[PDB]
């Protein structure tokens, strides 16, 4: 109900929507300035516009706020509730020993190449697609990869928003 | 050592500097793109330029990530380690029932007017100073207050950085 959303104090709006972009409450806090919203699509569009207004470093920064697939946070049970649901859904919590090592190596190569973590919309992909995509995007030039990666962020955000 | 800072993996740089702007690790994460940093001043300069490049809503967003002085999070013991230290140093952790209620009302008026929390460099102000600032700044136009508040965020950030040093 967008009417209830529109009457939210900023503190409650930030509590409700503060993690639609992983560890970036500033982004959802910002868009509250554009209330009232027509609908959830309006909120989505504002978030996309905000991300797009950022310098490249800002986009890279958003990426760096995301946890590795199957990395330290997943293994240590210190993911945000959203990342935990997403990573479980993509098969990350039931990887075997060889798969864990493989994800480590792939993540390591990616982050060494690009200087931010590998991000892919987990809810839209299964385990096998994830590995294929890691390997494929590993071949991208940095500018093209930044665009690709941010598109994945925007997909994650849309799903998060619609899960609320 | 700035050499040691420059050698940090982004994951470690974010871990160390991720809260120099309250609940805004994104800012520390972004500026790592600009390494090597010449010095501490370069880091602060990159932080300042990043914030300045945001739309006004982004600057408001940053403000909205800060907890109220003496507010719900302080009472619940759920402030960030830095925020707790800053507010304790400013005398917010030893207010009586009356004071706790009074902080609430001035903050309510302010946030209703401006649409973001009252932010002041707390390590540079005592109990009384804070109230006077709140009452004076309540008079500002919104355009001006945003600029005033963001300057305070940058002061807080500067001192958070120096504490790490
Ligand atoms: N959905 C999703 N994709 C990711 N890509 C990298 N980390 C994540 C995560 O936590 N969730
Ligand atoms: N230093 C400091 N100033 C503030 N102004 C409003 N909240 C805070 C806070 O947590 N710390």
UniProtKB/Swiss-Prot annotation, chain A:
Enzyme class label: lyase
Reactions mediated catalytically: 5-hydroxy-2-oxo-4-ureido-2,5-dihydro-1H-imidazole-5-carboxylate + H(+) = (S)-allantoin + CO2
Role description: Catalyzes the stereoselective decarboxylation of 2-oxo-4-hydroxy-4-carboxy-5-ureidoimidazoline (OHCU) to (S)-allantoin.
Binding-site residues, substrate: 67, 83-87, 118-122
GO process annotations (BP): allantoin metabolic process; purine nucleobase metabolic process; urate catabolic process
Chain ranges passing through the membrane: none
Subcellular locations according to the entry: Peroxisome
Subunit (UniProt): Homodimer.
Residues of the active site: 66 (proton donor)
Pathway as given in its UniProt record: Purine metabolism; urate degradation; (S)-allantoin from urate: step 3/3
A molecular function GO annotation: 2-oxo-4-hydroxy-4-carboxy-5-ureidoimidazoline decarboxylase activity
PANTHER family recorded: 2-OXO-4-HYDROXY-4-CARBOXY-5-UREIDOIMIDAZOLINE DECARBOXYLASE-RELATED
Keyword Flavoprotein attributed: no
Predominant cellular place of this UniProt entry's protein: other
EC number: 4.1.1.97
Top-level taxonomic group: Eukaryota
Descriptive protein name: 2-oxo-4-hydroxy-4-carboxy-5-ureidoimidazoline decarboxylase
InterPro entries listed in its UniProt record: OHCU_decarboxylase, OHCU_decarboxylase-1, OHCU_decarboxylase_sf
GO CC field: peroxisome
Entry keyword set: Decarboxylase, Lyase, Peroxisome, Purine metabolism
Family: Belongs to the OHCU decarboxylase family.
């Amino acid at each position: 109900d967008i009417n209830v959303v529109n009457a939210l104090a900023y503190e409650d709006f930030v509590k409700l929507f503060g993690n639609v972009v992983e560890k970036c409450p500033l982004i959802s806090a910002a868009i509250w300035s554009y209330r009232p919203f027509k609908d959830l699509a309006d909120i989505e569009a504002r978030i996309s516009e905000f991300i797009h207004s950022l310098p490249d470093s800002g986009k890279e920064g958003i990426l760096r706020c995301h946890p590795d697939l199957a990395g330290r946070d997943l293994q240590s049970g210190t993911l945000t509730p959203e990342s935990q649901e997403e990573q479980s859904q993509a098969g990350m919590t039931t990887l075997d020993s060889a798969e864990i090592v493989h994800m480590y190596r792939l993540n390591s190569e990616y982050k060494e190449r690009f200087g931010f973590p590998f991000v892919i919309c987990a809810r839209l992909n299964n385990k096998a697609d994830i590995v294929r995509q890691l390997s494929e995007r590993l071949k991208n030039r940095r500018t093209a990869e930044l665009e690709c990666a941010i598109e994945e962020v925007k997909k994650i955000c849309s799903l998060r928003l619609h899960s609320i």
